[PDB]
Amino acid sequence: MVPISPIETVPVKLKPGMDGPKVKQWPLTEEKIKALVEICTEMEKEGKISKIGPENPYNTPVFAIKKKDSTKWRKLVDFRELNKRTQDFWEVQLGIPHPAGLKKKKSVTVLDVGDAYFSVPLDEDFRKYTAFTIPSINNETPGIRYQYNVLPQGWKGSPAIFQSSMTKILEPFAAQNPDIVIYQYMDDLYVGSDLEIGQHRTKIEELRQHLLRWGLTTPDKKHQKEPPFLWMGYELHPDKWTVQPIVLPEKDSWTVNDIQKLVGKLNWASQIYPGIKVRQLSKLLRGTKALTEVIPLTEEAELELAENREILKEPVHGVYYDPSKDLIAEIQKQGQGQWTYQIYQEPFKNLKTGKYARMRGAHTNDVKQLTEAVQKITTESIVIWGKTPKFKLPIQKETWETWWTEYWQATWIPEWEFVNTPPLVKLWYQLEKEPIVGAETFYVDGAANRETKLGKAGYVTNKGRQKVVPLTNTTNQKTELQAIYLALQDSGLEVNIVTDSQYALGIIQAQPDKSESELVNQIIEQLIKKEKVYLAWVPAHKGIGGNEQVDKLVSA
Amino acid sequence: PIETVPVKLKPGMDGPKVKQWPLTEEKIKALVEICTEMEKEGKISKIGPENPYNTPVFAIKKKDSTKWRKLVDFRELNKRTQDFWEVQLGIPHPAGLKKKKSVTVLDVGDAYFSVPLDEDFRKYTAFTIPSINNETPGIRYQYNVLPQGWKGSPAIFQSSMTKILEPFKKQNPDIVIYQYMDDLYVGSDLEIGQHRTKIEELRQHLLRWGFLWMGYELHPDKWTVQPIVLPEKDSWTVNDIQKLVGKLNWASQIYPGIKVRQLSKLLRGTKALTEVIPLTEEAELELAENREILKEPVHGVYYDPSKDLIAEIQKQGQGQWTYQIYQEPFKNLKTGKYARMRGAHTNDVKQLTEAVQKITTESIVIWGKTPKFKLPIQKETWETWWTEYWQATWIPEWEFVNTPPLVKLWYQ
Ligand SMILES: Cc1cc(/C=C/C#N)cc(C)c1Oc1ccnc(Nc2ccc(N3CCN(S(C)(=O)=O)CC3)c(C#N)c2)n1
Fold first, then answer.
1. So what does mutating residue 442 to A actually do (chain A)?
2. Is A3-92+118-158 CATH 3.10.10.10?
3. CA A501, A507, A508 angle in degrees (round to 5)?
């Protein structure tokens, strides 16, 4: 007999203060007990479990289920209670690779390590918490008591300890064979390389040799799957990759569950299918928790869906990552706060695509939205490829320079060059830094009554021009915006505006080009038409003339 | 130092469980090399899945150094590590460190790697070298000695550090030496020629007791509350007087007796913004009395070591940045301004990142602790890029300002 190395045991503890599980064993049918006893007697012969005495005070229920064509009962141990009491582990399998970050491999083998899983022993001081009882026939003898010696299926710490134990075993083989790559997924093991079909087969035998040192027999996976690998919702091909088939259903009655399963398909497809839009379909789910509510599609939601069927009419594919070539990312504005981007290395051979949606807020502008999308692509690219891509953005170099130099916040976008793909991101207005000579000066103010909601907004100017407008169903902040709107409405192409509204200044200094406030949008449409707008602020109720005259005119 | 100092978290707090943010390839490769040697020297060791804790890690380059350095964002562990009184009820911060002409900052963090850590505490210093595209499981480590950037590292080492410095302090009683985390602040009151000699004579003395060869020179001579200044003009426009009254109205929150009645009396009417208004006798007087008030410091300002230090920053354009350090609004304990940030005339974030480091260094020298920053930047932008320009072994706290402050004009 050939000595094998013992797999190093991982010390496991329960959560602090908690004991082990003491769940009662359900009554089972006689025909069920006979099937468990047969299964466990085989498992006991294989060393997986071991009989124990009645001194062990823990128990975990066991169950018997079957398949309809498989003519056998199956053995299920319900570790729901022991999992609640088991410590937390470093779950090292949460994040999966993205296909756009993989390198093409000429040859790839699949090895089954299902029998390898049972070779992983369990911490001896923890095995007593995995006790379970097979009820006896007619409850006339003590039930057969067992405990696990290996990682039990369904236990909390089994996947992390199995993946970690296999990683430690493979580490010498991988580190010293740098011309191959190894990846583990469930009871499978995937090894890929660019060696010839001969040298590739030798390394697999060398790797089979290396796994026998701990005594792990690994044959090939049953029914060797032909291209593509159906893995985690993807189609992995020898040279290309794409998502599993995105078929959008036809329907005349869409519930909010149908729209939910829809958006999931577009969101998943949007990583390779360029131009996918999901908002007008997401606006039909703004606030609901019951899933049958048939919500009629707006004319914009249909137009968005039909635009997606056109994008999903023909299958598109992503290429694998060539580290020797540059990484490029290109963004396009799509309207209503939506943005699409493509990431590639050779023109028209996308690695992946994606989309970004504008954040929820009352005011915004295109440059902010473009900046946010760039950061998201930056973070995604560093995850997938470990580097920031070169950006091609639809904004003039002069526009961006004027923006960030005058913006009150600090902002930065990495290396980027302008691409002339309309619609171009532009600055729709720019306030003056100094008062304008010869331009009429509009002193504006508004005021409302908190109780009756009645208010007034208006202005007085240095040329004697005046206006006061009465308002109903309004607030102090709304009349302050209305007053500025009136001055913009009634002035020439160049105008100085004096206000005391810290609220209005805070909005305009944020430089929005679109707003959820219909009144702010109207002010923006007026600023766009102007030539020079100098917005000046003064404190209220301090005797500033012009401000004092119009404050009394609008306050009752 | 065979004996380990018993360390424990605070009651009812688990160890840190902070996600590791993505790293570039060159930083992953750098961290792999550094950690491979550190593991060979026994400073760190591989860990298994039974350790659920994690503390983020990345790689920087210290001020004008081409070698990659490992930085561990121990911020969460430091708040969860129990409040330390390792030798005494606390260290009295040297108020004379901020009064010296020159202060040199030495990175003495490599001396921490000589004393082991409590075995029961090593699991809380777990960190992960991430992999590109999750293609391999992350390399998991935990520390065997005191790690750089941990609150307990200077505390546990204070007993050992004070004995290394005792003969150098015995011969130079006028030299102030202060320690904050991985840094030694050594200041004196003398000409730089003998200062670098004393500094060189200090690190050679540290070398014989068991370094890095890098320094950071400061001059806390010019650290105070910068005064509020009003313009001096011969012809005032309506716009000039409006900004003046607005600035004086803002200062009136801080200072008493600030009057604006006679200056507002100048704006009697609805005049053009560019029209020049002559100052009356009662207006120039009111402006003069306001100048006298603003010459004097703020009433009732004091540092409270129980409260947080708050540091606000304003972007002023052309590489200029203003800031204020306070604990209560309108009670500024320090104000200042920066200009022409080195190597970033075209990068706003790099300038802001360098400003945060400078303000933090100033706060360490004055009060012995770092402030909480209100940063004029969107969360996602700062979050993505600040590590690319960070060069200090410590990391302060920060929040994000999303509404443009009107007081930016008043610090212009
Ligand atoms: C080797 C490997 C395997 C997996 C398996 C997951 C599953 N089911 C996952 C990772 C992360 C993985 O690791 C890496 C790391 C870096 N680079 C790549 N690149 C790459 C390049 C080509 C591939 N193949 C596509 C499909 N096949 S085939 C017979 O035609 O279906 C042809 C070859 C595969 C695969 N496989 C992988 N893989």
1. Virions contain primarily p51 RT
2. yes
3. 90
By the CB < 8 Å criterion, does B376 face chain A? Answer: yes
Technique that determined the structure: X-ray
Q: Which two tokens stand for residue B94?
A: 């040297």
Number of residues assigned to chain A: 556
Domain A228-321 listed as CATH 3.30.70.270 = yes
Question: Any idea which residue has 């169950």 for tokens?
Answer: A63
Say if B392 is an interface residue toward chain A (CB within 8 Å): no
Q: Do B273 and A496 touch (CB under 8 A)?
A: yes
Element (H, E) at B246: helix B238-251
Residues with their C more than 2.5 Å from the N of the next written residue in chain A, i.e. before a break, are none
The residue whose CA has the least distance to atom 16 of ligand 1 is A102
> Does A429-554 match A93-117+159-227 at the fold level?
no
Alpha-carbon distance of A176 to B131, in angstroms, equals 18
**Cβ within 8 Å of residue A307, ≥6 positions away:** A275, A277
What are the residue ranges spanned by the domains of chain A?
A: 3-92+118-158, 93-117+159-227, 228-321, 322-428, 429-554
Rounded to the nearest angstrom, the distance between the alpha carbon of B42 and the centre of ligand 1 is 36
**Burial category of A230 from C-beta neighbours within 10 Å (exposed 0-12, middle 13-18, buried 19 and up):** exposed
Mention the CATH class of domain B96-120+162-217: alpha beta
Q: Quick one: B218-303 is in which CATH superfamily?
A: Reverse transcriptase/Diguanylate cyclase domain (3.30.70.270)
User: Measured between alpha carbons, how far is A121 from A8 in angstroms, rounded to an integer?
Assistant: 8
Distance from C-alpha of A126 to C-alpha of B50, rounded to nearest angstrom: 13
Residue nearest (by alpha carbon) to ligand 1 atom 9: A183
Ligand 1 centre distance from Cα of residue A262 (Å):
29
If DSSP codes are grouped into helix, strand and coil, which group holds residue B218? strand
Domain at A93-117+159-227: CATH architecture: 2-Layer Sandwich (3.30)
Please report the number of interchain residue pairs, chain A to chain B, with beta-carbon separation below 8 angstroms: 185
Other C-beta atoms lying within 10 Å of the C-beta of residue A290: 8
CATH superfamily membership of B304-412 = Reverse transcriptase/Diguanylate cyclase domain (3.30.70.270)
Which residues of chain A have a CB within 8 Å of the CB of B377? 409-411
Backbone angles phi, psi at A194, to 5 degrees: -110, 15
Q: d(Cα B266, Cα B271) in Å, to the nearest integer?
A: 10
Q: What residue ranges of chain B are covered by domains with CATH 3.10.10.10?
A: 6-95+121-161
Instruction: Report the distance separating Cα B234 and Cα A467, nearest Å.
Output: 35
Q: What letter does residue B81 receive in the DSSP assignment?
A: B
Alpha helices in B24-151 (DSSP H): 25-40, 75-80
Q: Specify the CATH number of the domain A322-428.
A: 3.30.70.270
Phi-psi sector, A549: left (phi>0), alpha (psi -120 to 50), beta: alpha
What is the residue with the minimal CA distance to atom 24 of ligand 1?
A: A238
